[PDB]
Amino acid sequence: SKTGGKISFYEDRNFQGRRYDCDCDCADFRSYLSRCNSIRVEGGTWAVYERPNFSGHMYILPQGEYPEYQRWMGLNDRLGSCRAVHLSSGGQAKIQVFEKGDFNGQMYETTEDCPSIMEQFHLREIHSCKVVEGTWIFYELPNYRGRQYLLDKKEYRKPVDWGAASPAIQSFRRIVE
Helix, strand or coil: CCCCCEEEEEEECCCEEEEEEECCCECCCCCCCCCCCEEEEEECEEEEEEECCCEEEEEEECCEEECCHHHHCCCCCCCCEEEEECCCCCCCCCEEEEEECCCEEEEEEECCCECCHHHHHCCCCCCEEEECCCEEEEEEECCCEEEEEEECCEEECCHHHHCCCCCCCCEEEEECC
16 A cells, blocks of 8 residues: 655665665755765656755755766765655646746747757746746756756746746756656
8 A cells, every 4th residue: 555656876886885775855964874875766757956955965866776976966975865856747837937926028838848948039038937837957067967946837926936046947847647
């Protein structure tokens, strides 16, 4: 009955050393593991953070096996908390973006991923956006690179409403499966 996603962290490379298995979000795993240099994802998609309380660098990990941290693009082997990412299906994911805050300025509507916002819409920044269909991720650098943020069916009127300290956004993609 306890069906769910599962991730395993190993203190040494090649899944060697002490191992820890988690089946739910954990705000502080420091008491069970002092470091993690490799990870195995058996099911589900998870977000890992460099420091406790989902803070510091954040990385999205889909199901799969990573015998070494570099295979997950980790900056180092420090991980203090992890959360399971829930995927929403339904039909066609839809997002709208506005040039000014409070949904003002020019508006653009799209149902597909965008690798470079400036190349597609000639926009250098985005100050408001309404996502209400499926889940969407935004990335600070083109080609889905840099810090990434998970967006749910929500209405964002200010850039800080996205947890971002600046209205800078260069690419976004829809999450499926």
